[PDB]
Design a binder for this molecule. Structure first.
Ligand SMILES: [Cl-]
Ligand SMILES: [Cl-]
Ligand SMILES: [Fe+3]
Ligand SMILES: [Fe+3]
Ligand SMILES: [Fe+3]
Ligand SMILES: [Fe+3]
Lengths: 200, 238, 238, 200, 238, 200, 200
């Protein structure tokens, strides 16, 4: 058969990933421009939301050295690839869990609806890649929203998860943090309530 | 905004390391036990950030000068350079390449590293750059020392530098580790050996590159990177 | 005083490097053009100094502590150990072994070295010890970096440590250089290649020795040394 | 044939040999006890002599980074192998050429006569091994004394040098330095007046 | 009392059998699922019992006479002898060696063994001795027969003798099984094959040793045992 | 790299380990001297204690054929390697689980404190090696004591266990058994409450 | 290590180099445009100078078939790569030795100062490549000027020559030839007064 050049193989980001990708967390000085966890300036359109979560291993213990990258549509359902700290909105961001409490946070807006390749609307989602010590190749997941039940029910991506119970692992819970709209999205890498991870 | 106009060759997850590789102990509790769920590529997977207008500092790619506290860092001066291409051999221009590493003694500048080898006051350990219009990148740094770690009772990482590469989409994004030609620690490392195929391991080994060295100044290593092949859509929805 | 009671196997001067090895440029003007004159061994050649009562400082064999100016040196912590034997396999006990090297960056603490890589304030670069009663020695140090030098226009020494060994007579005394397993600079060096026989070159390459390492502390390399075989006189003057 | 373990092959001592073997010359601090160029305390028996010399390459230029080791009998013709800085005499010593003037010096006594393995007296001599940058394996020579003409003429070692003219290259010249007896012994590694080097 | 003045080479747990080897069915439920926790050696691990003054019976090493109920046991009379050394090749003297086995028909003298082959009234199946000053041990016994067992539906152990070896510390203590040269059961046994490396398996196979036999009396097998290498501490706490 | 002789590989002790190492238990006659479960005679100094325990497999069932070896300091925190049945105290002993109830017992004194190689004190502990059918290489663990909670919290070995919850698996529970001090130490080879096992 | 395509190996230019590169000298007709020994027309700015020289072999005999290529800065210390016979000045030229007297000549201007890559000024020099029968790969040298003695003493290229005596081999001697400024630059390929040759 036709064999292309092999892709460079993945390796763990390691426990010191923050040295390179989350400078503050390492305990180190930042540079003038950093890619971080604020995807929206306050004046960006759409519903401003706080996202947060914790990451658990197979023994139910916190993964305190997680590094997460996220990619999402703006409120109008458009992906903005021209990354610029001057932008009111960027579709890309990074976050990491505190070594103490193990919680990550993102500041963003709720993404608009985007169609799949066959023209079928997907429910509002944020694409997430999770890296850490002990994770050899990053895990892909999606965060959906519990206040989009009708859309979620019809999402052609959710509907590829064979067991309906597993779909629930990708639905973030709406709450309030300091009077402001928030969603919690915990990830369980392994075991009871294991989060669905994707290949594509 | 971004558009869905391309598809990415599916990953070979037997070429990559598997999730569960128990000799690397931390992978036991941090690998899923359910199978990954395959989904078709959509605009969500086939687009990603472009960092052309990220503002880089003058020394962001130069670890001999980007943590300057009154001197040069101690250690083997090296250039690390190479090309980023996709599996079809197409160069990957204007892509973000980030790297980080321990100092010459295997000590990381991270609060959680308590290895007894000292920090170097003039070494930070992080760099970034974009590939040029032909897909080439380059960094200047010091060769990192091996790092012992609490896996087995006498486990030492080979000298290594972490690399993160964005590429054209979130589907291409990769973190990996570069190792150095001839390092006798490479065959012994349970992280290297998370990769089952010996030919894949060889792909992570940077080669001494005398041609790119500065005489009387610094040596050089070459580390090329291959990201998933990108092709146009064909015959979809018909 | 010393006595003439032994003979030393004649050196193989095609195993050793020859005097004239023109790719090592300085050897051109510093090699004799007349043949060496062979003489029989006498008490003058077959005796030599014994250094049992040389007084060694506490840290004389420990380069991590023998140039202490307020900290540890930067670089890869290693033990260098091995055995000194003669060609018959007999151990060479209580013999003087001296070693010196550049720091982690390939910079020597010598007024004549002006290589732009910095000195390390806590690294001196010299050690000494005696072999024990079974012929073993050991040093603790940092792995030296490669050193560029003005031979060809882009010539770099592999990482190396100089060794001098007295042995039982002036006929056994040797200076050599230790190199490190896997170093891709080794095949390229005109000083290494002053040795014509590739099997002799291999004898100068120290092997990674995980068995002798201190976990979470320092790696180790093993470098054994073989001096001329010593035998009793037989059937002389009759 | 019978083949023993091969000897570890020699390499050049290099230009920085003084770091390890001549600490003062490197510009570095010395340790408490150093092996150096004074073989005799003032009260040692025998005739106290200053030795000195320069070392020339094949183009007649000074070898300013030479390192020399010497081995000689005491005044009574006995080799003293028990090296000790408390000794009135040691048979072993080291010296090196100044980078500026290129001259080495030794402080010693004139060695007594020692017999070869066949019982034949050798003329008074000091055994010398010369190391440097550009010298792949050290060169062995002997220093004899111009005021021992009768002994020199009969030395079974000198007499193994086939050409009488070459014998003259091993005879040090008696002079006076500050009213004290001295001998000059220059070495020419290559070319006109090339010093005899030995194999044994 | 005992002192902490030695270190033991770290075990290669890919040379030893892994805990989870599912073809040996009982290992499925009796293997940890969490990784082992590596700890540095202290006096707790580098010391152990010395049995120099354990009182041995006259026949403790002699299974032909140590269960005498009126006659000799039935089966192939053999000496089992060998040397215990460490990985550096050093003999391990005055160390306790215990062995136990089935009889000539593969029946064990244990309440729980109900294999239908009969017990032998003059065979018990247990020996012990200390190695001598040079590391050698010696037993006299009957060659055990294959033993069927409820693993797969037709599984049979090759002829085997269990060994337990104390060595110099609890870090060196080992239980293993000796197998016999040429036994065609060896490659088919899921307990043998718990060891993944064929070279490691070969290390358990005792060799026919005609040199050590008693003519017209008994054959002999030779089984050398290698315990973890022991070295002195060096450069610790400095 | 340097490769030494390979160590002889481990094999399971098998279900009939008792006939070689626990002779009483096999159903068999004992020799005059046996190494068994009484480390201390009534006269040994220190607090005399009974230890007891059961061993479970990954299905929560008793391992009724386990064999255990133990190594502990005397009451002074000194290891006694000179094994002799005449000693008031021996640092080493053996025990095995009953086939009926599956309990092992040991008769000993509570060990004194010993320092690690870095000079930091370890909480009082007994070193244990566990052998059985199904265990291809013996499992190492340590028994610590629940009446040493303040010492245990500072043990540099317990502190190498990353998760505090797992440290609890090594703490034996003090009780009274026929009016004497006892501690129960149960071992779970696999699953919920899996006992920590060491490599060194 | 990284290995590129190997360079095409050099071979001698041979005794008949002139037929390809010095057409007049071969005895042959010339083409309309030839690259030859006049770098400067009368009108070029700078001090017009005649250069001349002979080439000797290791036996002190003239090399009567040498071919030389030269490369120098203009009077401003700028290299002019746009080669054109219409130019008042060209930085490049060729010359060859007469078979009869063995002398080459060049008609040029004295070059201005150029800095090395480190910004340190080089003494005025002409770069020379020498080809001939018996020379398997061309020899590189530089012609410096004896009326620039103070600049020459500080040239960082001359200072890379370890022995001051050898630096003298690169200094052309100023003279007057038919009332115009001239410099003689003789080259000794081998032996006494051997000209320094470079590798770069
Ligand atoms: Cl610092
Ligand atoms: Cl300094
Ligand atoms: Fe790392
Ligand atoms: Fe050097
Ligand atoms: Fe069995
Ligand atoms: Fe031709």
């Amino acid at each position: 058969p036709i064999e292309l050049l092999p892709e460079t193989p993945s390796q763990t980001a390691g426990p010191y990933v923050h040295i390179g990708l989350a400078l503050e967390a390492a305990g180190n000085p930042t540079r003038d421009q950093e890619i971080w966890n604020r995807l929206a300036k306050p004046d960006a359109p759409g519903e401003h939301i706080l996202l947060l979560g914790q990451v658990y291993d197979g023994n139910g213990h916190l993964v305190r050295d997680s590094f997460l990258e996220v990619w999402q549509a703006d409120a109008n359902g458009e992906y903005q690839d021209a990354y610029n700290l001057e932008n009111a909105f960027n579709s890309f961001g990074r976050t990491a869990t505190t070594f103490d409490a193990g919680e990550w946070t993102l500041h963003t807006v709720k993404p608009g609806v985007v169609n799949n390749a066959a023209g079928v609307p997907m429910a509002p989602h944020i694409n997430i890649s999770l890296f850490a010590r002990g994770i050899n190749i990053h895990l892909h997941t999606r965060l959906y929203f519990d206040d989009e039940a009708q859309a979620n029910a019809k999402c052609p991506v959710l509907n590829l998860i064979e067991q309906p119970q597993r779909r629930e692992t990708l639905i973030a819970k709406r709450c309030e943090v300091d009077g402001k709209t928030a969603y919690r999205f915990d990830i369980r890498i392994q075991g009871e309530g294991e989060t669905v991870f994707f290949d594509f | 905004p971004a558009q869905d106009n391309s598809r990415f060759v599916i990953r070979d997850r037997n070429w990559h390391p598997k999730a569960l590789t128990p000799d690397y102990k931390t992978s036991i509790a941090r690998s899923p036990r359910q199978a990954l769920v395959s989904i078709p590529q959509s605009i969500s997977e086939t687009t990603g950030p472009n960092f052309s207008h990220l503002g880089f500092g003058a020394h962001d790619h130069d670890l001999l000068l980007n943590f300057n506290n009154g001197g040069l860092p101690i250690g083997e001066r090296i250039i690390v350079a190479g090309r980023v291409v996709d599996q079809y051999g197409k160069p990957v221009p204007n892509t973000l390449v980030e790297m980080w590493q321990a100092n010459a003694g295997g000590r990381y500048r991270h609060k959680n590293d308590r290895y007894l080898a000292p920090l170097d006051p003039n070494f930070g350990g992080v760099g970034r750059c974009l590939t040029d219009s032909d897909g080439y990148y380059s960094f200047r740094t010091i060769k990192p020392g091996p790092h012992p770690w609490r896996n087995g009772p006498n486990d030492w990482r080979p000298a290594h530098i972490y690399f993160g590469i964005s590429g054209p989409s979130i589907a291409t994004k990769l973190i990996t580790q570069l190792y150095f030609e001839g390092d006798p620690l490479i065959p012994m490392c349970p992280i290297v050996k998370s990769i089952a195929n010996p030919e894949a391991v060889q792909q992570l080994i940077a080669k001494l590159d005398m041609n790119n060295a500065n005489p009387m100044d610094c040596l050089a290593y070459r580390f090329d990177i291959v990201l998933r092949g990108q092709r146009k859509t064909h015959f979809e929805n018909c």
